[model samples]
Target: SNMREIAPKEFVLDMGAGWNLGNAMDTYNSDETAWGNPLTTKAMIDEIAKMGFKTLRLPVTWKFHIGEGPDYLIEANWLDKVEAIANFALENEMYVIINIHHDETWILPTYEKADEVKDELSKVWTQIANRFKTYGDYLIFETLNEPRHKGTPEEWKGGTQEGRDAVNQYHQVSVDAIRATGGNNAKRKIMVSTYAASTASNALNDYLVPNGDKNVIVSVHSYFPYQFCLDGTDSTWGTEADKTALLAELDKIRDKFIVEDNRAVVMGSWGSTFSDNPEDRLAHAEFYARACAERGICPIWWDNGNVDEFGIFNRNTLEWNYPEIAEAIVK
Candidate 1:
């Protein structure tokens, strides 16, 4: 398929609910619980749209989609469920970004099985793009999620570089797979991620979008001062200085792209709190989003319906903390 085009740039709302809502409905994984009453449903999509969220970044796990692939085939039920969710989001007038999430055993470990990884990666994306090929430009594809994991700077550096090359190749395969289907996907925009998906300079430098696809976007998952972003158990990134320092580090990391000629637009895919306190965490989130905006970058919320405290919207009450940060950049 040819590369799909998109608007120059726009704010994105990444509504990622962990666990599998599709699985919940299909009983593919009964043990998993639902995060909210309407997750992956039309009602939820309508509500998110009402909140003025222009885009929805849906992170999907495709283990069930393309079963253990040399020859990948998507499970029928899973395929229908995904289509259902995407349909809801697009029907709601929201641009949708569908991506493979948590597919990597651990982030950036593709190098471990390099020989077979490329083919396996292609199989997955081909199945994904083909399945959703008719969805139009409202839909986009993301390469992988947090492709970086437990490793020192050097190990991560080398491993990520290899993985970077692999992803670019996989992207080409994905574009081809989609275009081969003969529809809007021919020119559908695709997103390629950096290593670890962190705001690191080396990781960003390690990956580049394939040539001739201006429709592509480069993505990074930022969980600054990790202790605070994840591990709802740790503490940090609450102070103003901590916030400032994080932005400074972000700028340094983004410099890798600013210095490049064909770098894709950078996205802050997932950044938020794991704590119960909404006030402070929302302030921190706002600060982070503002930083991205100032640098001409886009910030996306990473909410995994840990509701009462962690979700963008409180599940029990169906309320959102839009007031805290929404007012700041809902332009």
Candidate 2:
């Protein structure tokens, strides 16, 4: 394989700042527009690449298309559909990240579910890894996105001891499954999501990095401040205090993963929703892009299409809906 072999830290830097093709591929129904987003096209991907975004996080949910037990074969059409989108991103000269998104229906992070989840996770990833084994280093495999015990209080707030342990098992099984496929999988950088992919102390503290695999990267999702970026309780942002708190979270992530554990982190998702505060959103983008850069973590903007417009890209017209905010992110 004529792939650029680089270390995880440097590779993450090359991944740089990017956008997530969310609300489309990761929808539960497996229909690209199940969540009311326009069908993804190469033109859309090309536009983001034109903005200097280097990585395209292609989040995918497999529950609807996954076959029954045993081999658990992914639907052929679905696999081909995902592969086509990934190739478009690759051709657009952007790094592509394909992850099993929203499959927590079967990937429950609990000791009771571990046996089934682990086995199925291995089988699922084995097929995925083998299919893309020939893909280059730019193609990343994130084990799972925000795996957790859903519908429970612990779902987002850290996780139970049993759940955390189960997450580790699932990650290792998937990691091993990929490596065994050979090809670029030998040195290809893979990402493992922390329980719920949470940045909270408990999840971060308990996430067990896969045994001894060097190419596995840690994946975490961060939406700064409960009241502002998320929740929608507060419609406005852009204050020195808001900036300080966001930086504090970044520093904490850097210290815990990069500084202490010597791991490369990809903020799998981060963005401020457009609450009619374009200026504030732009400032937030600037702070996050630079802060994540300084900490050496690639923060991919989570654009769920039209839901809240957390990002600048407009899927319908293929335009930067918030040009200033997008420019701030690229800058």
Candidate 3:
């Protein structure tokens, strides 16, 4: 009862169904459109709004646009571009969530880079929070995306103690940095994640739920039954085992954080990927999303791009490649 109280479960519910704009702004050290998707426009986001999507998760990289150490000031022009796109979503009555993505180039969860990385993290996030202070709770901030020691043997296997502890510390610094900006920043909803945003037992079991931060929600990504979603080894989904495979992890997080810690959970980047099984894909999408909604969790579908094998929405044509899949999630 000492710190400010925030209804995080209600906060996320207001977000409705969420979609990810990945491989675009999150492209490493390149133009936003370098990844082959057309530059996002108001028209495209409007189409999403029409489809009943109420939230847009923009994955952006800032390492290429921020200055070095101590100050780590963000570039004005870059900020302007990000702001312009965010405005597009807000105008369409969609909740906007922007985050540090693809910055694995520098934001590693290792002690050796801790001092330097944390400094830059604090300063850069401070600038972001200050700039977005005018926005309402509809505009959210996700600390980082899939942070981990990339290129390491442990990157996806769930990191060791050194990596896990430092990752939690980084989130603390990130939350503190944003909250320090005051005003709306103090109450703005934040998302924190463990290494790689994995549903693996190693990562989730080791995750350190942030202490006493009511406004912050726990974030994680799942590409469960990897044979279907990630590996493309299985062309079908929707079996009893498949349901349990995905729901079991959701239940784990739901119980640990939402049930025990009383915190909200958001499946940030997840969903069925393409495997030439439209009926199966739609079935999986509907069930997974329904389960999330009933549990009071917000699930964000990761739509890579129109031309991408994993993509369902065609930004160029302004049409859904798999309208049924979209319908299932938003429904």
Candidate 4:
């Protein structure tokens, strides 16, 4: 289906289960393989598609690959590599989401330095938009990944009002930059987010969707029940109460962003840190996927390409480390 013609809810429903190509292209250390994941290949992408994942989120870090001045010219080789990986997904007819990931050090949208951040951000997207402008709707452009300050006191909790406004401005700058590129981008669907892509009520309520671009969608990250998802010591299993809390959170997103705003919601990054028991992982995975489906949100798993905690797939062998967990997600 052509994404441009579909309703936002339909588009997200069709997106189904997604996986993030994390720690590879998004490595802030300057090398794609610096995070220990091998360079993504066509075979790997093909395997992911075969596994029933309908979308792939490519978290790309461009700070080190671009120039230092106002132009921020993205290196030709780096652009080519990103395009190649995107092609692997496009060839399979999978929805592909590419975003400026981990560029926060330079793309920081803070209260004090919003102007400088917006200037560089516009330049970066201008180049990126122009590069992939001709691509079809299967390719989606995301403005930023978790736009926020690094060491702020409220970094994790909903950021300050100034920080939230800065993030909103950055989203506007990005949408305008991409739309100006013309081609498919003229009507292309763009994903924008709140501070740190938080699903908190304040963050979601404050998110300013760019006016005039009806093709835009809302993006947020939530690893709900963080105690069970992130804290290693918390081995509490998934329970009915836990599932109710998850649904309630999704309902909050639906009421505020999806139903009220009529913009589709995508849980751009979500997954547990790791669980020793396969049942624990499987139970959460199944519930998360179902909740997303019911609420008209797309759930994208975060695979950091490691065999350790939070690692979903083994990059070396091109296999899901826990096949049952993977099955639970897509089923």
Candidate 5:
């Protein structure tokens, strides 16, 4: 089916629940096995689908998997590995997202390096687009993950204007490359991110989705109430006021992007780090999933496969380690 033919509202709504294949392909370490997660197999992908996830985001770091020159030829072995897992997801009839992640140091755009950066971005995406051109619309390609300088002072707080502009240029290059492939890619749903995928107003305002492609979707990452959700420094949350605050944040996206801009939105990566209070985490997950669903937004949980972190399920045993959390989000 041509996913683009699906209305934006239905598309986002259908992507009911998503999980990130973190610490595997996206690991910056030289070896995929170095991240302490086992190699992703057809069984692993199958289990994720069987667990009630409708979507899977495979974050792959291609920096070390490509060649040295301008061509940036992706190694056949690496491409095959990615294709295998993607196939697994598709075979199980799940929406799949693949993106350039953790390539910031190598391909992150800057004003000074904009030209060279665009060249690399164009080359890499063109190759990827062509390679996957035959895949159906159930598979989506995201431009880049975060896409900001690593050591800059404004790195996490919303990058500099120059960086933001560079990011837009990179997105333009990516969209052009993918569209140029001219197959299912012409109408395939492609996702682009704001600076650092920030939910901050300024970053959202700065984001420029490429024009003329209604098939495009806006991607953003949110781990709200940082202290309670991610920092693990706060012991509690989930009062009525806390729930209201979270709802307001989702409203911002609805008003700004969905309502104002008529764009489909994806909370591409989100999940609270494990805290001592599991009840709070469960409440947050339940609220987050329901809120996003009500507003026609897609939420993909980040799973690092560590019980201490955001790990939700044990891949080896095909069992949900945090059954309450899993049930809260999916149900």
Candidate 6:
């Protein structure tokens, strides 16, 4: 399937909790041994499939894969780990989405040296494309995550137009290089993130989805009521009335996708919280899931191994009221 648009009945369930090697220890630096608990082990994957999730998005940092610069030798051990996880998901009958989770330090800015930027990016994708060439459609590739704070608006002398144009060009290079390697990835579904990881209002306008394989989807991160969903509070960006107003603001953001005529579908990265109480958290999850479903959109919940103030369940139990909230939306 070309994935022209997200099917109305399709649902995606993102797995892994702070699984990215770079995210695990800030500084975005990793050595050859950046390991994640075998959380996505074969047994766990079986459990996820039984839970009714049809897709799993795996986030990995590619810097660990590329040792130095031009040479760009992939660490065999690290590659083995990622492959193991993907195979587990595939064996369990789930779709897998993989990408350069934390390579922004090199790819995002410092593009004044366009050649260097594009070369390094090409090398990274070349390695990626070759490694997964044998994998089937169950695997998808995401170009990059949120890429804000890369540079100031003023630094971009050519303005938003120039910055956006550069990103579009960069992504096209990646897409073409991937397709060049003949395999399941030849016609594979590839996802690309907007300028700022799919922010709102004017944020997405500056992004351009490069054309290549017909299978491409646009991705964005939605952390509405940031205070509550992220900071675990409701007072950062709004007050009593202001907080209520943000809800309407969010709906408006969703409408921008339809109004703008972008080529790919929107995936809501982070939404409501699981909160201290599992029941309340499940209720909130169902509430947001249904809201997006009603709008004909897909939502992905982010979990960070916490107590569920924002994750899906108590970290210790690793269990959730899947039936209650999972029922509100179809996968």
Higher-scoring candidate on TM-score, 1 or 4:
4
Question: lDDT of candidate 6?
Answer: 0.57
How does model 2 score by TM-score?
0.97
- For each candidate in turn, give its C-alpha RMSD to the true structure in angstroms: 4.7, 1.2, 2.6, 1.4, 1.3, 5.2
Per-residue C-alpha lDDT of model 4 across residues 184-284, encoded as one tens digit per residue? 88888788888999987788778898874788889999988788777766666677888889888888988998777878988999888776666787788
Residue pairs in clash, model 6: none
Per-residue lDDT over 1-331 for candidate 5, one digit per residue giving the tens place of the 0 to 100 score: 4535686667878888899999899988868877778889888888788878899999999988889876889988988889998999999999999999999877666788888888988999998888899898889999998999888898888888888899989999999999999989988898899999988877888889887478889899989887887788885878998989989999998999999998999899989998777888888899999998888899999999888898888877877889887777777
lDDT against the true structure, each candidate: 0.59, 0.87, 0.84, 0.86, 0.87, 0.57
Cα lDDT for residue 172, model 4?
91
Looking at model 3, residue 157 earns an lDDT score of 79
Clashes of each: 9, 0, 0, 0, 0, 0
Q: Give the TM-score of each candidate.
A: 0.79, 0.97, 0.95, 0.97, 0.97, 0.77
lDDT for 9 (candidate 4) = 71
Give the lDDT of residue 62 in candidate 1. 64
Clashing pairs in 1: 1-179, 2-186, 3-187, 4-187, 4-188, 107-147, 108-147, 108-148, 148-196
Q: Candidate 1 lDDT, tens digit per residue, 1-331?
A: 2223344343222322111122223222322244233445677667666766666677677654566546767687776777788787778776777777756652235556654766677666777777876676767777775554445454434345565565556556555655566667656767767665655555655566666566666677666756677667655446768866888767765576544543545463555564655666766776776776566666666655544434555434556644454444333
What does candidate 3's lDDT look like per residue over 49-102, in tens digits?
A: 899999999989987788766677899888888888899898888888999998
Name model 6 segments beyond 4 Å from true: 1-39, 150-163, 235-254, 258-268, 272-280, 313-331
Where does candidate 2 have its weakest 10-residue lDDT segment?
306-315
Predicted structure 3: clash tally: 0
Report the Cα lDDT for residue 156, model 2. Answer: 85
Query: Candidate 1: where is the Cα deviation over 4 Å?
Result: 1-39, 106-112, 148-164, 179-182, 232-240, 262-268, 315-317, 321-331
Model 1 accuracy (lDDT, Cα): 0.59
| Model 5 local distance difference test score | 0.87
Model 6 residue 151 distance off true place after TM-score fit, in angstroms: 7.6
